[PDB]
Write an enzyme that holds these catalytic residues in place. Structure first.
Site, PDB file in Angstrom:
ATOM      1  N   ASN A 174     -40.385 -18.095 -12.540  1.00 21.51           N
ATOM      2  CA  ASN A 174     -40.314 -18.891 -13.404  1.00 21.51           C
ATOM      3  C   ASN A 174     -39.123 -19.508 -14.019  1.00 21.51           C
ATOM      4  O   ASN A 174     -38.237 -19.160 -13.387  1.00 21.51           O
ATOM      5  CB  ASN A 174     -40.981 -17.887 -14.137  1.00 21.51           C
ATOM      6  CG  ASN A 174     -42.226 -16.875 -14.019  1.00 21.51           C
ATOM      7  OD1 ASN A 174     -42.259 -15.285 -14.429  1.00 21.51           O
ATOM      8  ND2 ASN A 174     -42.948 -17.452 -14.060  1.00 21.51           N
ATOM      9  N   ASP A 209     -37.397 -18.670 -16.854  1.00 23.04           N
ATOM     10  CA  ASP A 209     -36.235 -18.113 -17.636  1.00 23.04           C
ATOM     11  C   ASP A 209     -35.734 -17.318 -16.237  1.00 23.04           C
ATOM     12  O   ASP A 209     -34.899 -16.734 -16.685  1.00 23.04           O
ATOM     13  CB  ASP A 209     -36.858 -17.262 -18.012  1.00 23.04           C
ATOM     14  CG  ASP A 209     -38.009 -16.325 -17.571  1.00 23.04           C
ATOM     15  OD1 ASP A 209     -38.198 -16.502 -17.034  1.00 23.04           O
ATOM     16  OD2 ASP A 209     -37.980 -14.835 -18.310  1.00 23.04           O
ATOM     17  N   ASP A 231     -42.953 -13.491 -10.402  1.00 20.27           N
ATOM     18  CA  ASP A 231     -44.095 -13.287 -10.586  1.00 20.27           C
ATOM     19  C   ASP A 231     -44.335 -12.781  -9.073  1.00 20.27           C
ATOM     20  O   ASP A 231     -43.923 -13.637  -8.176  1.00 20.27           O
ATOM     21  CB  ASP A 231     -45.336 -14.411 -11.276  1.00 20.27           C
ATOM     22  CG  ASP A 231     -45.071 -14.535 -12.476  1.00 20.27           C
ATOM     23  OD1 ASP A 231     -44.536 -13.901 -13.647  1.00 20.27           O
ATOM     24  OD2 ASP A 231     -45.614 -15.415 -13.301  1.00 20.27           O
ATOM     25  N   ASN A 252     -44.555 -10.171 -13.521  1.00 23.92           N
ATOM     26  CA  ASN A 252     -43.659 -11.090 -13.919  1.00 23.92           C
ATOM     27  C   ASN A 252     -42.459 -10.115 -14.239  1.00 23.92           C
ATOM     28  O   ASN A 252     -42.613  -8.327 -14.848  1.00 23.92           O
ATOM     29  CB  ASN A 252     -43.588 -11.076 -15.296  1.00 23.92           C
ATOM     30  CG  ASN A 252     -42.445 -12.178 -15.708  1.00 23.92           C
ATOM     31  OD1 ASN A 252     -41.457 -11.951 -14.979  1.00 23.92           O
ATOM     32  ND2 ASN A 252     -42.960 -13.062 -16.097  1.00 23.92           N
TER      33      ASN A 252
END
Ligand SMILES: OCCc1ccccc1
Ligand SMILES: [Cl-]
Ligand SMILES: [Cl-]
Ligand SMILES: [Cl-]
Ligand code: NA
Length: 129
Positions: free
Chosen positions: A46, A48, A52, A59
């Protein structure tokens, strides 16, 4: 492991997902198809810096520990690597916590965008269960 469609449906039912929090089995199979293509080894990073993991793309921001997601939580109390096993037990157990956390299966944006409100029973059609 890459599950077959009906094979995964079976496994999810054995592990108690059918109508868990009110979500029929086809919802869970549909989500896994679009999250992972039924591949337990799926990972995706992801924006940030979270990751996942597994058949349901759980996550590291909240649910599992991978040692490389600053500030994150590990609410399922597991290493993220457990979510990549051929055995889906850890993924299922953690999914039950996620789906119980207030937003139901909307927690999975891919479920919201690709499964919600569709004919999800088609995903378990034909399957022995
Ligand atoms: O689709 C995103 C890719 C991803 C997977 C595992 C680790 C880093 C990146
Ligand atoms: Cl269904
Ligand atoms: Cl971390
Ligand atoms: Cl709900
Ligand atoms: Na974490």
């Amino acid at each position: 492991k890459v599950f077959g469609r009906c094979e995964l449906a079976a496994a999810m039912k054995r592990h108690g997902l059918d109508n868990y929090r009110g979500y029929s089995l086809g919802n869970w199979v549909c989500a896994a198809k679009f999250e992972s293509n039924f591949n337990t080894q799926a990972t995706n990073r992801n924006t940030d810096g979270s990751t996942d993991y597994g058949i349901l793309q759980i996550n590291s921001r909240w649910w599992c520990n991978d040692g490389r997601t600053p500030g994150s939580r590990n609410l399922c109390n597991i290493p993220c690597s457990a979510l990549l096993s051929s055995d889906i037990t850890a993924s299922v157990n953690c999914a039950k916590k996620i789906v119980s956390d207030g937003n139901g299966m909307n927690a999975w944006v891919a479920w919201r965008n690709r499964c919600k409100g569709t004919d999800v029973q088609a995903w378990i059609r034909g399957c022995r269960l």
